[PDB]
């Protein structure tokens, strides 16, 4: 009564789950980084060859 019922925290994170939240750029920024690194590597290799 005085801890679980009186409290303000519902102990069920099973109903009303995570709604549609789009893909962040944090999963995409590291891919952009290796893209730019491969571009610069290819530029320098083409210049020295």
């Amino acid at each position: 009564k005085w801890w679980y019922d009186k409290g303000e925290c519902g102990a069920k994170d099973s109903g009303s789950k995570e709604k549609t939240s789009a893909l962040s750029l944090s999963n995409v920024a590291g891919v952009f980084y290796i893209l730019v690194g491969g571009l610069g590597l290819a530029m320098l290799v083409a210049l020295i060859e």
């Binding site: 549609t20 789009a22 893909l23 750029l25 995409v28 952009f32 893209l35 571009l39 530029m43």
Partner: protein, 51 residues
Amino acid sequence: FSKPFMSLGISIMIKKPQKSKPGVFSFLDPLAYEIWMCIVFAYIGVSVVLF
């Protein structure tokens, strides 16, 4: 009192959500509306690299 003619009880009233789905705006939902511009910019940049 007489016999009850109409039975009733306690019910739940909600906002009654409809199928409010937009059109062309629903297509560019899942990734972003701003990562695609960087994708097209990297596309034209890699084409500049190839040319």
